[PDB]
């Protein structure tokens, strides 16, 4: 996350860290005691999920770790166009909830009007450094039209974009699958965006979570 800052310790109980071979691969969002939502392009065999973490360098008494027993990529995911960039991961047993581990409600209504949002994650910062402490930033949704104008021919109804023209707050490498939170709902997942990271010129592109309500419910009760 570029041009952000460290989050408060109790403000991200839904954030998951996805690990592979002992290193951060992506973020994720706890949406149910058993299920973490992330981006499809984060797919990798033998993922490891860390919940309740704030500082990746320290072992924390609040953290919980789990292997992924099922990874459900959306059937319509198109890696070439980033369309339908969403994946569900079932944990090995339900997470034990606290003030530091807690699921986040999904945005169910694609017409929801809240435009003030924030993003968070352990991805690359403005310095190019990978931080141990999770970073936060407030950004705002941008119009579908301004999204299309930024990436002509690339924005589908399954995508949302968001950014900050004042400082260019934006997601970066390591943030994929993490939450775009608007009005205390999961509005999007980090997917892709401008090279280099930074939203002064073009916003970041997020997976439009409200489109997958039914797919998520049917996956979870399968």
């Amino acid at each position: 996350l570029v041009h952000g800052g460290p989050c408060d310790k109790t403000s991200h109980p839904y954030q998951a860290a996805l690990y592979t071979s002992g290193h951060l691969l992506c973020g994720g969002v706890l949406i149910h005691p058993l299920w973490v939502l992330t981006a499809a392009h984060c797919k990798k065999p033998n993922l490891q999920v860390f919940l309740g973490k704030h500082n990746l360098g320290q072992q924390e008494s609040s953290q919980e770790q789990s292997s992924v027993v099922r990874a459900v990529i959306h059937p319509d995911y198109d890696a070439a166009s980033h369309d339908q960039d969403i994946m569900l991961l079932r944990l090995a047993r339900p997470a034990k909830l606290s003030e530091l581990i807690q699921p986040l409600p999904l945005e169910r209504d694609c017409s929801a009007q809240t435009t003030s949002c924030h993003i968070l994650g352990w991805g690359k910062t403005a310095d190019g450094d990978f931080p141990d402490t999770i970073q936060c930033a407030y950004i705002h949704l941008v119009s579908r039209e301004e999204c299309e104008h930024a990436y002509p021919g690339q924005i589908t109804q399954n995508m949302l974009c968001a950014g900050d023209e004042k400082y260019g707050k934006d997601s970066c490498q390591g943030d994929s699958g993490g939450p775009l939170v608007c009005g205390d709902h999961l509005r999007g997942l980090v997917s892709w965006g401008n090279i280099p990271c930074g939203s002064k010129e073009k916003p970041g592109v997020y997976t439009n979570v409200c489109r997958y309500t039914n797919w998520i419910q049917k996956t979870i009760q399968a």
Partner: protein, 53 residues
């Protein structure tokens, strides 16, 4: 020809550990791949990177 292209992170925001052939070092080296796009100077293992470049 492929092995002298720069390492491309791509547009996606993941943190994959991949391998690319560094011309100045004449060896293969790690780089951060974002998970989509990029070019083909991008290998899963260091062995495979050197088997090709």
């Amino acid at each position: 020809e492929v092995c002298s292209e720069q390492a491309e992170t791509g547009p996606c925001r993941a943190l994959f550990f991949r391998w690319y052939f560094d011309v100045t070092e004449g060896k293969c080296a790690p780089f951060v791949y974002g998970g989509c796009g990029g070019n083909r100077n991008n290998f899963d293992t260091e062995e495979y990177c050197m088997a090709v470049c």
